Design a binder for this molecule. Structure first.
Ligand SMILES: *[C@@H]1O[C@H](CO)[C@@H](O[C@@H]2O[C@H](CO)[C@@H](O)[C@H](O)[C@H]2NC(C)=O)[C@H](O)[C@H]1NC(C)=O
Ligand SMILES: *[C@@H]1O[C@H](CO)[C@@H](O[C@@H]2O[C@H](CO)[C@@H](O)[C@H](O)[C@H]2NC(C)=O)[C@H](O)[C@H]1NC(C)=O
Ligand SMILES: *[C@@H]1O[C@H](CO)[C@@H](O[C@@H]2O[C@H](CO)[C@@H](O)[C@H](O)[C@H]2NC(C)=O)[C@H](O)[C@H]1NC(C)=O
Ligand SMILES: *[C@@H]1O[C@H](CO)[C@@H](O[C@@H]2O[C@H](CO)[C@@H](O)[C@H](O)[C@H]2NC(C)=O)[C@H](O)[C@H]1NC(C)=O
Ligand SMILES: *[C@@H]1O[C@H](CO)[C@@H](O[C@@H]2O[C@H](CO)[C@@H](O)[C@H](O)[C@H]2NC(C)=O)[C@H](O)[C@H]1NC(C)=O
Ligand SMILES: *[C@@H]1O[C@H](CO)[C@@H](O)[C@H](O)[C@H]1NC(C)=O
Ligand SMILES: *[C@@H]1O[C@H](CO)[C@@H](O)[C@H](O)[C@H]1NC(C)=O
Ligand SMILES: *[C@@H]1O[C@H](CO)[C@@H](O)[C@H](O)[C@H]1NC(C)=O
Ligand SMILES: *[C@@H]1O[C@H](CO)[C@@H](O)[C@H](O)[C@H]1NC(C)=O
Ligand SMILES: *[C@@H]1O[C@H](CO)[C@@H](O)[C@H](O)[C@H]1NC(C)=O
Lengths: 236, 364
């Protein structure tokens, strides 16, 4: 049921500034009105993030995903190493009612997409291991952070009402932890899933690196400001 | 005081002898409501069980299963656990469980065991010698056996090779015992490997059908998922006790706190990375932890020559848990004092105590 489209989806790979986005709560510890320095994986401040207007991209240590979403065009994500039935593959789909997560040796087509008139992008579902169902994730700004360490897959999410024209806004907002998976996979590449109807979506991608940050906790325990210690000497 | 000073005479003054602390009373634990029970009811109470050579395989992972109810149940004829003892199975657990359910004869229950050989143990199902898990067998004569002949059940009888551990064979190939080829038709040296079971309600002990479920436990590097719930007791407040809140162990007194945890934190620390607040997994409320009182003690004496009675000062301790009666007990900014009476006059300071007050001998 899966066929390759004619026109090439050569979305322009532009570049833009990261500014001060990509900060998440490192743990579930409550702190009130205190400055804490922690070393972990973060997106460096004022970095260079890639803008797409869908080639397979390497996963590396962690991935920061940003979407100027309108009417929920992006629908799912694919994670794996060989992207076939020879290795376990992780599939996430946020359909109209719920979110479904599967860990199976699927057989994906060359150009998988949701198809509208649920899941048909895979020809086979062999040796399924883990299944999960939860509430749906989604002119809105959707921010996600995906990490995979020591057999644990961590997903952080944030939703924002935005009205800016083109690029990321100049602001600060922490990413609360959303989903944890106790499944051991060595994902190296990932993919995006589109709700394309047979008859232009843009997003931002950034990578993570290990570094030290200084976080400020207010009275109520919400992160309100952060400082990167590897930046200009004033920051150090 | 004499032992500390290492002398038989003591001059007037205040001396620091030892320390004091409040011992814990009891131990409490707290764990969440523990839900999502494993669906073991549909397996042990299934309407029908499959054959020995077509055993049903079920995967158990990511749930909670109570082994006490099945261990204490008397409906199981044989309950043999090889890897671990059944009593300790409720605590220790592995990353996944595989349930293999089938029906055999009464005499074939021993064949389904590690290091066992036989017709069933070699042609229908095989168990490894180092198998870890449990086997539960119960008589099913009243249910599986048919007066008209429960011939739906079948067992393998002939195969060229044996069976590997955890291997299921459902092939219907015509076994050729001899060297005479057969074109799919049974002959002198060709017979059907499968024989139907002839269970009857009244057939004697040994020939009755027996439903057997083997739980094989595997501990792949994935974290363990399925095992018994953690027992939790009621919390005790306003007492210096030791607690084990969801694996966090700490000794102190527990009070009600007005902190406003954001809905994803569990416990909090103020500074220097020491816990001060915690949220209980059951009630979902914020509680405060305070180390129970401790401090040094001191003795005030007017000199061994002058008199023979002394007073005792506990430093930085509220006058609520002193132990022991002596005289009237006084509460001061420096702590609590036992053995002296408070007056309203004001004289020169003889034996300094603190907070602008001191004691003297007149009694003390
Ligand atoms: C969106 O996804 C949900 C989650 O899988 C679907 O709900 C399931 O629907 C099937 C068949 O309709 C049922 O057998 C399941 O029991 C449902 N699961 C839950 C948790 O309710 C839903 O059908 C999907 N919607 C569309 C339009 O594909
Ligand atoms: C189905 O998948 C599981 C896990 O995804 C496979 O289990 C493997 O078992 C071997 C044997 O010890 C281990 O070395 C591997 O680490 C396990 N995982 C993987 C991903 O290979 C299983 O072999 C697969 N096939 C089946 C059950 O037929
Ligand atoms: C921190 O929490 C306090 C208490 O929840 C907040 O104080 C309240 O703020 C609301 C506005 O959202 C007022 O309507 C209430 O009257 C305030 N109550 C009190 C007792 O002051 C405070 O706004 C929060 N601050 C932040 C930055 O989140
Ligand atoms: C854990 O289970 C207990 C037991 O039901 C829950 O306590 C109930 O709480 C509701 C709401 O406050 C009351 O209406 C019930 O009467 C309580 N049941 C009792 C006291 O037996 C508790 O809410 C649960 N905690 C969870 C699900 O987080
Ligand atoms: C020692 O503990 C007692 C018991 O709480 C304290 O007495 C309380 O003091 C507060 C402060 O005014 C009052 O509001 C309470 O009514 C008192 N309770 C009782 C039962 O009397 C006492 O203050 C503590 N001592 C010190 C030095 O703090
Ligand atoms: C980001 O990368 C692009 C191309 O890789 C480059 O032209 C641009 O100058 C970079 N921006 C920086 C380094 O701030
Ligand atoms: C992933 O592949 C690497 C490659 O060496 C291997 O070391 C690791 O064990 C693999 N992990 C999983 C979960 O397959
Ligand atoms: C099996 O028998 C009946 C079925 O309703 C039930 O009362 C009993 O508790 C069940 N046993 C288990 C272990 O689920
Ligand atoms: C105790 O002190 C008095 C004077 O204060 C002295 O006369 C007496 O001898 C002393 N007794 C002793 C040291 O045993
Ligand atoms: C004197 O001492 C008593 C008890 O020692 C006390 O109740 C009283 O307030 C003090 N002052 C006066 C003026 O009586």
């Amino acid at each position: 049921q899966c066929v390759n489209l004619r026109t090439r989806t050569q979305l322009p790979p532009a570049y833009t500034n990261s500014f001060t986005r990509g900060v998440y709560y490192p743990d579930k510890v409550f702190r009130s009105s205190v400055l804490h320095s922690t070393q972990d994986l973060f997106l460096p401040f004022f970095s260079n993030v890639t803008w797409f207007h869908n080639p397979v991209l390497p996963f590396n240590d962690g991935v920061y995903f940003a979407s100027t979403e309108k009417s929920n065009i992006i629908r799912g994500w694919i994670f794996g190493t060989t992207l076939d039935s020879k290795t376990q593959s992780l599939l996430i789909v946020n359909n109209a009612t719920n979110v479904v997560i599967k860990v199976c040796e699927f057989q994906f087509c060359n150009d998988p997409f949701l198809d509208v008139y649920e899941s048909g992008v895979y020809s086979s579902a062999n040796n399924c291991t883990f299944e999960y169902v939860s509430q749906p994730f989604l002119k809105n700004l959707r921010e996600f952070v995906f990490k995979n360490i020591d057999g644990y897959f961590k997903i952080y999410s944030k939703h924002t009402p935005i009205n800016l024209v083109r690029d990321l806004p100049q602001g600060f907002s922490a990413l609360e932890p959303l989903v944890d998976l106790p499944i051991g996979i060595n994902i190296t590449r990932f993919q995006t899933l589109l709700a394309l109807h047979r008859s232009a979506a843009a997003y931002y991608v950034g990578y993570l690196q290990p570094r030290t940050f200084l976080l400020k906790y207010n009275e109520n325990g919400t992160i309100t400001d952060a400082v990167d210690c590897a930046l200009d000497p004033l920051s150090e | 005081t004499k032992c500390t000073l290492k002398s038989f005479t003591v001059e007037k003054g205040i001396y620091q002898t030892s320390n004091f602390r409040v011992q814990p009373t009891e131990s409490i634990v707290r764990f969440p409501n523990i839900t999502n029970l494993c669906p073991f009811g549909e397996v042990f109470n299934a309407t029908r069980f499959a054959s020995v050579y077509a055993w049903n395989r079920k995967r158990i992972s990511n749930c909670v299963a109570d082994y006490s109810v099945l261990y204490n149940s008397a409906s199981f004829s044989t309950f043999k656990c090889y890897g671990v003892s059944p009593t300790k199975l409720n605590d220790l657990c592995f990353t996944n469980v595989y349930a293999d359910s089938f029906v055999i004869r009464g005499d074939e229950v021993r064949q389904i065991a590690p290091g066992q050989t036989g017709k069933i143990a070699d042609y229908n199902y095989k168990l490894p010698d180092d198998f870890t898990g449990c086997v539960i067998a119960w008589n099913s004569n009243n249910l599986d056996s048919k007066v008209g002949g429960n011939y739906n059940y079948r067992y393998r009888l002939f195969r060229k090779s044996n069976l590997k551990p955890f291997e299921r064979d459902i092939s219907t190939e015509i076994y050729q015992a001899g060297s005479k080829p057969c074109n799919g038709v049974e002959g002198f040296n060709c017979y059907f490997p499968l024989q139907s079971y002839g269970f009857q309600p009244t057939n004697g002990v040994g020939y009755q059908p027996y439903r057997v479920v083997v739980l094989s436990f595997e501990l792949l590097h994935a974290p363990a998922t399925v095992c018994g719930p953690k027992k939790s007791t009621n919390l005790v407040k306003n007492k210096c006790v030791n607690f084990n809140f969801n694996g966090l162990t700490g000794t102190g007194v527990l009070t009600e706190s007005n902190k406003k945890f954001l809905p994803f934190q569990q416990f909090g620390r103020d500074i220097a990375d020491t816990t001060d607040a915690v949220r209980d997994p059951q009630t979902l409320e914020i509680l405060d932890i305070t180390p129970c009182s401790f401090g040094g003690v001191s003795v005030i004496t007017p000199g061994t020559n002058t008199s023979n009675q002394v007073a005792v000062l506990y430093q930085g301790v509220n006058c609520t848990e002193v132990p022991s009666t002596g005289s009237n007990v006084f509460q001061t900014r420096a702590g609590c004092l036992i053995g002296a009476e408070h007056v309203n006059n004001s004289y020169e300071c003889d034996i300094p105590i603190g907070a602008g007050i001191c004691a003297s001998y007149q009694s003390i």
